[PDB]
Structure 1
């Protein structure tokens, strides 16, 4: 989970994490998400 912002970045990032509780063609991906905003570095 170490998110690396590159620079030249202006888009509101949604950092997801899905957990496969399911199987092949029945994935049922349980996700919780974190909305990441961007502070520039001059």
Structure 2
């Protein structure tokens, strides 16, 4: 989970994490998400 912002970045990032509780063609991906905003570095 170490998010690396590159620079030249202006888009509101949604950092997801899905957990496969399911199987092949029945994935049922349980996700919780974190909305990441961007502070520039001059």
Q: Would you call these one fold, judging by a TM-score over 0.5?
A: yes
- For residues 3-35 of structure 1, give each alpha carbon's deviation from its aligned partner in whole angstroms, at most 9, with x where no partner exists: 000000000000000000000000000000000
Q: Please tell me whether residue 29 in structure 1 is matched to residue 29 in structure 2.
A: yes
Aligned length: 42
Superposition misfits of 4+ residues, deviation over 6 angstroms: none
TM-score by length of 1: 1.00
TM-score by length of 2: 1.00
- Any unmatched runs of 5+ in structure 1? none
